[PDB]
Amino acid sequence: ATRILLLVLAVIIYGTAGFHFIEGESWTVSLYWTFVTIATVGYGDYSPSTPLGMYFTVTLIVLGIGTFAVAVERLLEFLINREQMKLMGLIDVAKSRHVVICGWSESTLECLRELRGSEVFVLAEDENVRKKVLRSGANFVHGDPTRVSDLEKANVRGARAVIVDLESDSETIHCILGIRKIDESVRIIAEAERYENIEQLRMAGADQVISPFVISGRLMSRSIDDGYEAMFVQDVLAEESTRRMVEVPIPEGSKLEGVSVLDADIHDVTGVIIIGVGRGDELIIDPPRDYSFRAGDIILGIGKPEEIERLKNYISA
């Protein structure tokens, strides 16, 4: 590790002391000559005429090739070890605004097409998951996501948001309970599977719990006869064929600070069905007529992509 610098300094001290007391030159001239001889430059302005010195330069050359052959071997061993350990996970995350994805399924592949490639770290343990992650453009960190000692190797303490989606519900509850021991303020998005585990995932400490299987179980049993709400849910939340569910923030100023929903009249001006208003980590669906807008609120509404532009300019000042 550091003995290479010791051997280099040893051969420099050997070359200086050998040249100075045999050729009889100055100390700076011997220093310059051994830094030209070790690097195999060979200016040839201060070559030794003495055959004793001519035998000394042979020892200096073989020692210089020896140090060059130990240093290249150490560099190659370090590089091969570092690039074999980096390939199969086995590395510590050094970033500070990354997104950790615990587990790997189809719902985390679809949230990878709206994020960056270098921003995400997938923390899993299986072997084909590594190849799927390296194909999809993420970084793979080998580790058990339920273990607390392997949740810190992905650096969950300095993460932006953590996305938990494991193969069962029990591992999801244990992964949330393991994350909330490390950092109590990080944002956790969890995926439930059974209906009975949503309150368990919320009490474990998740900030947002999504349950897709309950949504499909309710939409399948109400699409046997007619199936009209399934068309709305599909065409708005899944595909976005002609509509889109977007939210808009209210900026500073914003030309509407203080008016009511009766006086704003967003729907008949713009064409956006206003669902609810986001006043500080709560959702008031169908706000009453006397609700006054404020600064920094979030308006949730459904509209065509040409009406969202008509709304975003109506709300800006």
Ligand X SMILES: [C][C][C][C][C]N([C][C][C][C][C])([C][C][C][C][C])[C][C][C][C][C]
- For ligand PGW, the closer of residues 64 and 103 by Cβ is 64
In the list 68, 161, 260, 302, the residue contacting ligand X (rule: CB under 6 A) is 68
Q: What residues numbered 32-71 form the site for ligand PGW, per CB under 6 A?
A: 38, 62, 64-71
Q: Residue 74 binds which one of ligand X, a second copy, ligand PGW, none, with CB within 5 to 8 A depending on kind?
A: ligand PGW
Q: Measured between alpha carbons, how far is 35 from 12 in angstroms, rounded to an integer?
A: 8
Distance of closest approach, residue 122 Cβ to ligand PGW, in angstroms? 24
- For K ion, the closer of residues 63 and 148 by Cβ is 63
Distance of closest approach, residue 73 Cβ to ligand X, in angstroms? 13
Distance of closest approach, residue 19 Cβ to ligand PGW, in angstroms? 15
- For ligand X, the closer of residues 75 and 134 by Cβ is 75
39 part of the interface to ligand X, by CB under 6 A: yes
Residue ranges of the binding site for Ca(2+): 165, 191, 193
75 part of the interface to ligand PGW, by CB under 6 A: yes
Distance of closest approach, residue 131 Cβ to ligand PGW, in angstroms? 22
**What is the size of the binding site for ligand PGW (CB under 6 A)?**
17
Distance of closest approach, residue 130 Cβ to a second copy, in angstroms? 10
Cβ-proximal residue to ligand X, closest one: 39
72 part of the interface to ligand X, by CB under 6 A: no
Q: Measured between alpha carbons, how far is 107 from 111 in angstroms, rounded to an integer?
A: 7
- For K ion, the closer of residues 40 and 59 by Cβ is 40
Distance of closest approach, residue 259 Cβ to a second copy, in angstroms? 19
DSSP code per residue over the chain: --HHHHHHHHHHHHHHHHHHHHH---HHHHHHHHHHHHTT----SS---SHHHHHHHHHHHHHHHHHHHHHHHHHHHHHHHHHHHTTTS------SS-EEEES--HHHHTTSSSS-STTEEEEE--SHHHHHHHHHT-EEEE--TT-HHHHTTTT-TT-SEEEE--SSSHHHHHHHHHHHHH-SSSEEEEE--SGGGHHHHHHHT-SEEE-HHHHHHHHHTTTTTT--HHHHHIIIIIS-SS-EEEEEE--SSTTTTT-BHHHH-HHHHT--EEEEE--SS--EES--TTPBP-TT-EEEEEE-TTHHHHHHHHS--
Q: Residue 54 binds which one of K ion, ligand PGW, ligand X, none, with CB within 5 to 8 A depending on kind?
A: none
Q: What residues numbered 32-91 form the site for K ion, per CB under 5 A?
A: 40
